[PDB]
């Protein structure tokens, strides 16, 4: 019953690939546990990079995980935390390989289209601030 | 402008086609202005199906229904309540041409994976029932 | 329960679109009861076209039916007969409706990719003559 | 032997189909006999829609058709023009079934996404306004 | 000529992955000179597996192998074996890349989806026992 | 604005990989600047390869290069060139990885269906070569 945090940014929801990247997710067989669009506050965006705070690029990132809706998700699976971080790819879609969601739908690191829980503690600390409890399936 | 009300029912999730049906809509070039997974609790399935609580087949109709999580959605797009009709096929299965959604994924009328909104009136009353207003965008 | 008899002539198969072509029958739900590649002999040809054997057309007919391998197999499933051709779309590919298999695939009636049973009768003597009983699970 | 002459008009090749809707003729069996992304010019739209030059839609009809780059392409094959036409589905993307091109990504008329030789004499015509004779192969 | 086996397992049976992967291996260019659906046999299972008979997750491949039927198939072409090891990716989901087969469709190591050759010998001894010879076409 | 020439050589484009290859790129989120199918002469052939004059392989490739039409193209985009190649995968298909276009489509070195610039100098070398510069956009 592992599992992780997913987000598809404004840049992965306004070029429409949210149905092409949950289709990865659902033929690599892991279980939709969770899922909804939504527009990130300010202030929700502003504590999920809370640790960024002081860091120069915060205000980049608010601004623009705030700049449109993004869609949520839960995926259940065998070492899904692991697994979703390899077929993300590289942070940077440059260093991502071709195969995984980044290098195939993504040129810049500003606009990577997507995102996933780095650990476990990172996937419930990010699921109990998107999501409502009652929300998780 | 416009708006329909789309529903992958527990079959189409179960059998995870969610993300081949959401990139159909998106690639149509409609706009996802809400989606979320959610279970269909009794209530919601009576109120929804309330046209056919006389009939015999009411009671699995129902039990069906709420089997298992459904995705429900809402369109927005140029006369997207009959083109999403159009996309989706005949209720059922056996009428539903190739290239449509039932008649490319459905076999059988019970579990027809998908519904979608049969007018502007019920697209309104359908939305309102399985959406909170804060969940539009 | 039912089944019928499918094939991929042998410019489908020359053509790589064996594994295209059986997705289309996963995705619908239908179920591989028997599959084989295997070539026809001119037997098994002429015992198969037997109905054309008078017709001018025959000689050829037979001749590109054993001009490659082919794949035969049987699809299991509600109504997977009717279902079956409607997904082939019509014989000559001139009238067959795109998201059809012959419709997407095919471009003359000599070589239609594919055959399908006709009806109930057709599948069951197709199916015997195509398939040794212990193939069939 | 025979040729159509094919536009994926500026808004298919703003949106990315460029590749998927190639794909589809490759596919169907269609030979490719020219290709090229091109700049329409106010002339050669004004000579390609001459026909509406009165009507009072015939300035938007033109500043659409140039305001991006197109590509155009001839294809070849057995009847070609009337499957193509086919392909395509109705210009009215209203009445455009799915599995059809404007069936599965238009939306709206203005935007068609694509245009295909009516029949064969407008075939040659379109073809000769488009193409310089050393651009067919 | 030369050939490789490989065995779509139960789980890649029933999760309907049989036409995609072939249809992978068919636009890589390889050639499929065998291919059948087949239920196996314990005797044949425990014999497939004879060099593990004393290891301990012996009983366990031969239940596994067994637990429902699968597609046997052999490809042709340059360096297909050490090809298809490579397209089929690490032997434990988790480790392969996406991109691979098993990096795609795959979680478990006891439901890798699918079995490719390790060596030519493996090859012929494993083409030797799941096909006639007048299978190979 | 950083570009990159790619051509889909002989082979690619008789088995019909022109359009999905497009698509790659296309959904990677890169432009085309550029695009034609041509036919490369002799001395055009011997001119692109001009370095390789002395080679023994020379031969070689001036004959497949110009043993059928080519698709040309240029593609527009952060580090384009460096990332191009990437997508590609190895020169030699055997060692290019499942998910790069020569990993995906190609078993042999002398049809790898695909070429890109390997740096920003050859790939202004190879544009001014096989594009006018009104064909530029
Ligand atoms: N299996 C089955 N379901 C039926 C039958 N008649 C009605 N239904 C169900 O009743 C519902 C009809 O309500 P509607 O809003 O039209 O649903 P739609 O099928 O999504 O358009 C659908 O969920 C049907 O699947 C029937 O004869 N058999
Ligand atoms: N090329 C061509 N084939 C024909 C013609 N008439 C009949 N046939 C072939 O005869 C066969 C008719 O038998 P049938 O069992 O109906 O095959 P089906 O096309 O798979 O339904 C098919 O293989 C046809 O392609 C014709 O006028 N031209
Ligand atoms: N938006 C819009 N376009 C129209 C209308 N009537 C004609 N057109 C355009 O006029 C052109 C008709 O020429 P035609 O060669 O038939 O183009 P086709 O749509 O590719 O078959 C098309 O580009 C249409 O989109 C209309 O009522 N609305």
Chains 1, 2, 3, 4, 5, 6 share one sequence.
Do not use: C, W
């Not at 969770?34 to 990130?40: D, V």
């Not at 700049?67 to 390899?86: C, F, H, Q, T, Y």
């Not at 290098?103 to 109990?128: C, K, M, P, W």
């Amino acid at each position: 019953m592992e599992r992780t945090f997913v987000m598809i940014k404004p840049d992965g929801v306004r070029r429409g690939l949210v149905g092409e990247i949950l289709a990865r997710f659902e033929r690599k067989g892991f279980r939709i546990a969770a899922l909804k669009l939504m527009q990130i506050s300010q202030e929700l965006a502003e504590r999920h990079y809370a640790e960024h705070r002081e860091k120069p690029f915060f205000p980049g990132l608010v601004r623009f995980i705030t700049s449109g809706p993004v869609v949520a998700m839960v995926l259940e699976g065998p070492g899904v935390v692991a697994e979703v971080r390899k077929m993300m790819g590289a942070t940077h879609p440059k260093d991502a390989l071709p195969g995984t969601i980044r290098g195939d739908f993504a040129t810049t690191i500003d606009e990577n289209v997507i995102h996933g829980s780095a650990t476990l503690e990172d996937a419930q600390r990010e699921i109990a601030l998107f999501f409502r409890p009652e929300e998780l399936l």
